[PDB]
Write a protein that binds this DNA or RNA. Structure first.
Ligand code: ENX
Ligand code: ENX
Ligand code: ENX
Ligand code: GNP
Ligand code: GNP
Ligand code: GNP
Ligand code: MG
Ligand code: MG
Ligand code: MG
Lengths: 400, 400, 400
RNA sequence: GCGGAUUUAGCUCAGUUGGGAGAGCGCCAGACUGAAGAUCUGGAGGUCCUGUGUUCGAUCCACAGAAUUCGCACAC
RNA sequence: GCGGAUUUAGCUCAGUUGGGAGAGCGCCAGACUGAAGAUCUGGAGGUCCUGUGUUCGAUCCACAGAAUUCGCACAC
RNA sequence: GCGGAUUUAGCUCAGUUGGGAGAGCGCCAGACUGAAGAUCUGGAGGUCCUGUGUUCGAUCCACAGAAUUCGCACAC
């Protein structure tokens, strides 16, 4: 149901500091208007039996909403160390984010780690939201805990002292949107900190510009059997657009390029004609159950960039100084490689010249994924092995 | 069509002495009443073109009937040496039998061999029926030929002089039931010897007690494509009971456990609800032609005791003195093993202790059937190789 | 639509001398009557885009017609050296032919080669048609160019001076049948040379006698998907006859003997009951597209002479003197063998006696075709390797 | 459930009465060829389908199994 | 039925005019390791897809085949 | 998307704290047999599923992967 500017964002921060809560406080604060802005409550997201059981976001969750000017595609990341993988993924099919941060616990393990991941994953812009303020009173402490986030956002090459420290409270401002569902701006002093936070979004993040000029390509971000029909693959398409009924294909993880039909093309549960650039679309397909498509492949019309096992690439191994490894490695190294959606382990086989790649080193070499994948010379990709990120690089070529 | 006590029995004796004839003389003598007791004439049984052609029972045949008190499941065994296999089988899914014996030919090769088989196969009780009397007149000969059957039934550990020697004539008493179809007891002096014979059945054999408390299990005794539908597997179930329409399985001879439906559950050609314990039932199945089930497997609902190739067992090798072998044997010995229904050759592999099993020896060891089978620790089984029985034993364990 | 005597013939001669033209001049000259004799124009035959593009007959073409007495099955052969293969084929499912020869170019490469092929392929009778006369005027040249064809037809063991030299013009006599469609004999002096040519056919070729007393056997000469139905296999059957609806089989080239149905049995596009002996029939089949039958096999009812890879044979290797090879050869020799329809390479393996077959030599030995084929002891066959014919021989036996 | 077959060297076929099997085609050598193919002379290879019995000893006989093949029947 | 390709070492690719082909990746050695992986130095391997012709001699040329690939047509 | 398993010699199973694993069943030897089978005494074989980290050193520990298995959920 076409209309406004669909930008991509999200919340990423330590565990239990607020990512998940300050989310409804968007599907309410800016929902207190537009019939578009719907009912995205807390326990709403954390649908998972376990999630709500443990009390933490494990599984990635995304709940849209629109200010006035721009429409948004805001994703909610988990904070537990155990689940960065998921977290990572998200921050990949987005651009620019809200650094959820406890104003009562200062920075923390994930605080860093996440920003760092951001830094690593290259993310565009960030804006703090010094939250849980209400728990904090002593001012010498509220200032004192902004001087550390600037400090930190610096350390990880970032606007540091240039960034917005929208001190606020995700809960109080959400206990309001609950009482008075349609409270508007300039009404609640808590539903105000929120706006300042958006007046920083619209204010910090510039644009979600792209291009739908090159074929079907859906970085399959998700899959489910939606009762009564076939199955849908949610996932912010990079470059394509899908008018239901398009003979398609899945290019990746699965053996051969599976073909089916887009006879199902929703979007935010609100059917669209043919989703476009960066729009987190969501289509069904005729003849491809879940058993026919998993997070990872690239739903791509017959003929879009092919699947590969081998290939070549220009890589930059981060120094330990950048969270990379501290010991070089040589051929036989099998670190999983990340390609937008999924991640697959590949067996590095250094060039017939180099002998031992080292931290800091910037090099070239071959790879041989344990599975198949959508490759294209220039297709920049990331590398992480046991515990952390090691180096970034591009697909300099292809071999099979 | 439920009602009386279904006991299991049969006729076993030399070839041409009478087993097959003194059979109708039951489906008549006690048929001269109850509408249940039907038309089971001679040539009726020997349906086989060849059987009636050669003049001998080759193929196993069973024709029910009921006295007054108990109902019976009486089976007719062949006598020719060439066909003991069949004979054996029968005497397995029965209990207690009528030793058909010519009163004009004394005991004979099969006389012994069969009793012995009985003895070997462990059979409960036996009652002679010194037959063809009419051919015999001289009394010093009728007594004289009872003193040898006691003598013999002794030799093969049996009630010997305790057993019933119901001297009689299977033909004359069957030429009556032919003339006067409904002649009753105390009428024909030949149709009387018959009763004395039953008044010895009811009198000798005690009970056919059992239990239907453990799953589907049909020792598939027979198979045929019954015009217009699918196919039926006759075979006195040991422990189960089948209400038509039960999703089932065949566990044995065939590769994998074939699944189908009991949409066909006759019994004596007289449909029953759900046949039970030791009742020689007879059910059809949806999706399993003859080409899907052969004498041997165990029609057993999904989950009953599994199929095995390997396994362990406690065995008693009979001494030569007991009709067993006279030379020991060692590993590499491939004697077929008998499991209720069918019989399969297995490659004995003695324990890593014993070197040469000997007659008389009672031992333990491994086996490895040439095919698959329904095993269960405690599942007692028999062994016979070329020509005779060698030893009996139980499935002490299982291996695969 | 049964009626007259179906004899088999054709035109074979150098390239561009006339084979293709003096063809319509039959579907016209003798068509100027009988409604049977239809519209077979020049460019009609050469339907092929390329054929008419290059200006030469590459592809074999056959266009029927009937004099008065006998009906004919006349085939048009290509002349270009590049396409003898095709040419050859034709002259196989025919008998007796018209040596098309330019009266303005004397004999030529193919002139010889073709006659020779004829001679080689054993062909029965031949009649010249010294054509393009109109281009020629000087008589000392028209005689002079008949004295060379007799000369030649001699050289290649033939009636030589006994044969008909029906001097004529295929074009002029075809420019008439165009103007006056129903011009009759004794009318056009050019449409007369034609008759003389037929009055030489009927006059030279004696009979197309045969026998339909042995099973289905269609030397599959052609295949096409005929819009709306299944597919048809044209091809002068040797011995069979096919009433539509016959369960059939294809015995050759294809892996296993494919079975289908003759639910389609045309003939000259004029349905017949059940085509017969030597009649270039044409039947469809239920369940065998083109993808199920190619030029070569033998459509032969279930059970006709089997497929073979190995086999034995009595062979006569032609001397160089006969256009055969000039160097002997030994085991390992893989010359393609010709069997009526298709031709397949086979690996000769000389007998455990001979060491080196030589030109002139007449021998015996084994073969092992690269594919499967319809064999029968006595099934005479020809041999040609790179460029030419080498020797003829029969299937003395079979091996697999 | 019953009857006839046939089971042998990697392949196709032989052969026999118990002292334990032979051909071609491969196969690998040596000769010849730069090499290949062809050829010549050699060589290796078989639990003689399996068990048990009998025998001093079983490819063989007896008794029992098995695979593949042509047939006979039967709640048939 | 007709035309273009491409056929090479176990894998992926080279290479050339007739005297008979070279790389990586395997592969196996030797060094180093308790061993592995990594590495270093060696080694083996190709009937140059097949036949025939021509030649003293064919990976190569000629004539004929074959597999896989992109196209052309046709009772089409 | 989340959790429990289990991964070891050709096969079936052991075993442990970091100095690097043991049984049967095969497997091949030698004895015995003409040979077979049986038996006796020997022998060979495992990257301890994979990478990296830590360590002097990894089957083992840590961090990351993988296959197979039992469960939990979800435009579910
Ligand atoms: C899903 C597939 C997606 C792939 C792409 O993703 C995208 N974009 O989707 C990849 Cl291909 C990106 O396109 C690549 C990209 O964007 C590039 O631009 C790179 O990102 C860029 C070249 C890098 Cl790699 C920058 C790294 C900067 C690191 C810094 C400043 C480190 C922080 C140091 C502070 C600190 O104190 O850290 C502590 C201590 C430390 C120690 O002890 O030294 C250890 C670590 C600790 O945290
Ligand atoms: C279908 C599968 C069914 C299996 C079961 O079956 C069932 N039950 O269904 C089996 Cl598992 C049974 O459950 C086992 C069972 O029941 C046990 O109780 C055994 O049966 C029991 C331990 C045995 Cl084995 C007793 C044997 C007795 C033998 C005697 C008394 C021998 C006779 C001697 C006389 C004679 O002179 O014979 C001559 C001469 C002789 C020579 O020369 O010495 C040779 C032979 C001649 O005939
Ligand atoms: C499609 C399968 C069909 C197979 C059959 O097909 C059928 N029938 O369908 C085959 Cl199985 C036939 O049934 C076989 C058959 O019929 C037999 O009867 C043979 O045909 C017969 C035994 C032969 Cl082989 C005769 C050959 C005669 C050759 C001659 C007289 C040669 C001419 C010489 C003149 C000359 O100067 O030639 C020059 C010079 C020369 C040189 O230099 O020496 C070289 C060549 C030049 O042209
Ligand atoms: N005092 C105070 N408590 C808050 C505020 N925001 C959230 N909380 C409390 O913290 C709880 C859990 O925080 P939540 O938003 O789910 O954390 P998260 O970012 O999803 N972390 P993770 O998913 O990784 O466990 C809330 O339910 C609420 O009680 C706030 O602004 N002030
Ligand atoms: N005199 C006389 N003959 C009899 C008697 N019973 C049977 N017979 C004869 O013996 C014939 C065959 O006997 P039958 O019962 O078939 O023998 P069986 O027990 O089936 N033996 P098998 O089947 O092994 O051949 C009968 O048809 C009949 O003529 C009897 O009591 N007296
Ligand atoms: N002067 C003259 N020209 C003729 C005559 N017959 C044919 N032609 C010419 O030659 C042309 C081509 O001859 P055609 O019959 O197709 O030759 P073909 O026998 O099919 N040879 P190929 O098919 O092998 O090329 C005709 O179109 C026509 O112009 C004739 O009798 N006289
Ligand atoms: Mg969260
Ligand atoms: Mg009988
Ligand atoms: Mg032509």
């Amino acid at each position: 149901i076409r209309t406004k500017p669909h930008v991509n964002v999200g919340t990423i921060g330590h565990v239990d500091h607020g990512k998940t809560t300050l989310t409804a406080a968007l599907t309410y604060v800016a929902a207190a208007e537009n019939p578009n802005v719907e009912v995205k409550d807390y326990g709403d997201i954390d649908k998972a039996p376990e999630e709500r059981a443990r009390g933490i976001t494990i599984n990635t969750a995304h709940v849209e909403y629109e200010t006035a000017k721009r429409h948004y595609s805001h994703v909610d990341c988990p904070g537990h160390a155990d689940y960065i993988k998921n977290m990572i993924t998200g921050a990949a099919q987005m651009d620019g984010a809200i650094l959820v941060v406890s104003a009562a616990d200062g920075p923390m393990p994930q605080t860093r780690e996440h920003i760092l991941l951001a830094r690593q994953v290259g993310v565009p812009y960030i804006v703090v939201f010094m939250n849980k303020v209400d728990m904090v009173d002593d001012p010498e402490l509220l200032d004192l805990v902004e001087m550390e986030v600037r400090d930190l956002l610096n350390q990880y090459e970032f606007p540091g002292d240039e960034v917005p420290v929208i001190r606020g409270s995700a809960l109080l401002a959400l206990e309001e949107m609950h009482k008075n569902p349609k409270t508007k701006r300039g009404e609640n002093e808590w539903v105000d900190k929120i706006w300042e936070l958006l007046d920083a979004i619209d204010e910090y993040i510039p644009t979600p510009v792209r291009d739908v000029d090159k074929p079907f390509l859906m970085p399959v971000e998700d899959v489910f059997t939606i009762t009564g029909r076939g199955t849908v693959a949610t996932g912010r398409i990079e470059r394509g657009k899908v008018k239901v009924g398009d003979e398609v294909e899945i290019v990746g993880l699965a053996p051969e390029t599976r073909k089916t039909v887009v006879t199902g093309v929703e979007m935010h549960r609100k059917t669209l004609q043919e989703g476009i650039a960066g729009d987190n679309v969501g289509l069904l397909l005729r003849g491809v159950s879940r058993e026919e498509v998993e997070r990872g492949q690239v739903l791509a019309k017959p003929g879009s960039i092919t699947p590969h096992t081998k290939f070549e690439a220009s890589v930059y191994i981060l120094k330990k100084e950048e969270g990379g490894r501290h010991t070089g490695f040589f051929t036989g190294y099998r670190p999983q490689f990340y390609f937008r959606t999924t991640d697959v382990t590949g067996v590095v086989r250094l060039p017939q010249g180099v002998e031992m790649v080292m931290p800091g080193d910037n090099v070239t070499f071959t790879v041989e994924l344990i599975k198949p994948v959508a490759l294209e010379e220039g297709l920049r990709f990331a590398i992480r092995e046991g515990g952390r990120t090691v180096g970034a690089g591009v697909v300099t070529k292809i071999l099979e």
